[PDB]
Amino acid sequence: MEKRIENLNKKVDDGFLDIWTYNAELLVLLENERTLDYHDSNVKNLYEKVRSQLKNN
Amino acid sequence: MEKRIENLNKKVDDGFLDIWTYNAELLVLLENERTLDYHDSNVKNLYEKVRSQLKNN
Amino acid sequence: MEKRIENLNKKVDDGFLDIWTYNAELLVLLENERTLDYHDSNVKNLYEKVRSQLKNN
Structure with missing residues (x-):
């Protein structure tokens, strides 16, 4: 039977990855x-979001 | 018991946000x-998509 | 009754789309x-990911 x-x-985890x-x-x-x-704090903030999300997945 | x-x-709502x-x-x-x-209609169309999605979440 | x-x-499929x-x-x-x-292989790789994802949805 289908789980x-x-x-x-x-599907959600794989899609988010x-x-x-x-x-x-x-x-x-x-x-x-x-x-x-890459020196700009606003660009560093983007980089830290992507990094945080990839380590979490 | 786990809901x-x-x-x-x-998880889906938070991830989409x-x-x-x-x-x-x-x-x-x-x-x-x-x-x-920002003057280009194609760029305005991107902006309106992101805006629509953030107000919906 | 709610399905x-x-x-x-x-919601997941529509959001991913x-x-x-x-x-x-x-x-x-x-x-x-x-x-x-568009001539760069790294840019072609981005394009192929977006294309693959849209055809799958």
């Missing part, structure tokens, strides 16, 4: 082009 | 650098 | 400004 709640929890992994990859490309300055 | 569906609903809050913060940094022009 | 698991599954649609729209604006180079 509906376990499967939906796994894919979303935060994409956010990390875009942010590293924007920092490499220098679009955003 | 599994209530807890998974709270964190994702849309990040989208808003990146978009304001890209508009401040003028990478995207 | 709680069916409704939470629909809105998140990946936003990612696609931002990436096309950043490629149009040439912030990111």
Whole structure:
């Protein structure tokens, strides 16, 4: 019998991982082009959010 | 006893809030650098999506 | 009676669609400004992730 709640929890975790992994990859490309300055506290704040989310997943 | 569906609903809402809050913060940094022009209707359309999602959460 | 698991599954699918649609729209604006180079394999990798996610939803 289908474990509906376990499967939906796994779908949410996996989906959140894919979303935060994409956010990390875009942010590293924007920092490499220098679009955003890694020295700026507002940019550091973005980086810390993505990092926090990936370690949590 | 664990309220599994209530807890998974709270996890989804909280996760969506964190994702849309990040989208808003990146978009304001890209508009401040003028990478995207706030005058452009396609950029306004992004802004309205993030705004709609944050008010809904 | 409320179909709680069916409704939470629909909320997750719809939310993921809105998140990946936003990612696609931002990436096309950043490629149009040439912030990111569509010729770069790392940028192609972003594009393929968003594309994969939208076709799956």
